[PDB]
């Protein structure tokens, strides 16, 4: 199936890879691009797996994988957009092929060659590593035994959505471990499903409130109350000590003495970059942020770039970073595709992210957003803007229930001005003052 040589080889078939393939085809007409994906699915976007796909009025949404934004599919393109790998060398004006169900297990940088899990070898001229990451798991779950492990979900892929959606219709109690984006969005989604069926949803995490690492405490606490009003039993300040099976149910023991009985656990406790290929490829990994260490142009070696969740890159403006946003995979993937066709451009356009936690909670963010940084919040906590500061300069912004204003927030961070009155800057977001 796979040819012996391809001009453009993209390792991994996710958001960053697809954005790169589209970018290469737009900058190099007739280009021949091969995506190698270990998943059986064609490239698709993940955000709907924790949001729109759970709020669809169509009960066949699990099969169609379409959602209302305007209806559209979770796949970036239908199969008709792609050509087969076997035909990729011969088709006139080239195309984009995806070799599904295949994993790159060896990378030879000196010879511009990869080896697949089935023994196949492919040489390339330009290569992109866009392997993303794998969900982390709790140490308490790893030591819990096979039964507990079989009743614990790591949420990332289409299969995880389908398996958890089926569970929410079969069991009475689901527990989410994790207070970040994924845990909070799944809590609101499972909470909506539970209100109609009369079932239970629990979310526990060690922080004082949802999104405690991202939002200031006062806004994290406000968010926790909104999640609770979606039908979720939220347990902050919860550290899992052990997990076992008791009378057929899962028993979660917390360090503080509390105990939670439930039927199924969803672990949403972060992501580990997929850097397996750094060993054979002799590629540098970043010990501080994780991931493949690349420069401002997302380049690792002469013919190898890295994009997406797995790329630790140099931001000429904000310093060295690694970002795990959908839009960042798109932006970095497209940038890598342009540099794979001679652009030599540095990461410059700042990617944004967003989150929706029910009807009354939606926010957008950009730049360095971290609750450890000093923050200034200007609210009208219905609507407002939170500025994240470093050396008296705005390095990140969170827009709370403010939409269609991201270009303004992007300009403020790019300009790097020293603002003496952030209340005037809040007027740019139609806000007419909390500190942390
Ligand atoms: C449920 C969910 C909801 C999200 N919601 C949001 C949101 O609302 N807003 C937001 O900004 N971000 C969101 N994100 C984050 C966003 O989806 C990620 O930042 C984005 O998918 C990262 O793109 P990627 O290409 O770097 O990685 P991935 O999408 O993970 O793609 C990597 C692909 O490469 C495959 N692969 C790995 N190693 C190999 C190998 N050796 N050989 C072959 N294939 C390999 C992996 O199987 C995977 O298929 C969400 C993520 C999830 C999981
Ligand atoms: C930056 C970001 C934003 C989100 N809304 C998000 C949601 C998820 F479910 C998982 C990861 C996420 N990462």
Author numbering: 127 to 195, 199 to 509, 560 to 611, 616 to 619
What does the paper say about this structure?
A 60-kDa FAD-dependent oxidoreductase, AIF allosterically switches between two distinct redox states. NADH binding by the oxidized AIF monomer reduces its FAD cofactor at a centralized active site, allosterically disrupting hydrogen bond networks to release a 50-residue surface loop (C-loop) and stimulate dimerization at the AIF surface. NADH-activated AIF dimers support import of OXPHOS subunits by CHCHD4 and are critical for mitochondrial function.
To understand how SAXS CX1 and CX2 chemotypes engage AIF and enable dimerization, we crystallized select fragment hits with the W196A dimer-permissive mutant and wild-type AIF. To accommodate this amine interaction, the aromatic side chain of F482 must rotate out of the binding site. Aligned with this, AIF structures with CX1 and CX2 ligands exhibiting partial occupancy indicate mixed orientations of the F482 aromatic ring. Crystallographic complexes of CX1 and CX2 fragments with AIF(W196A) (C12, D3 and D1) or wild-type AIF (C9, C11 and D7) reveal stabilizing active site contacts and sources of steric interference that correlate with AIF dimerization rates. By contrast, methyl substitution at position 3 (fragments C9 and C11) and methoxy substitution at position 6 (fragment D7) slow allosteric transition. Introducing methyl at position 3 for fluorinated analogs C9 and C11 prevents formation of a C12-like fluorine-π contact, as the methyl (C9) or amine (C11) of the rotated scaffold will clash with L311 on the opposite side of the active site.
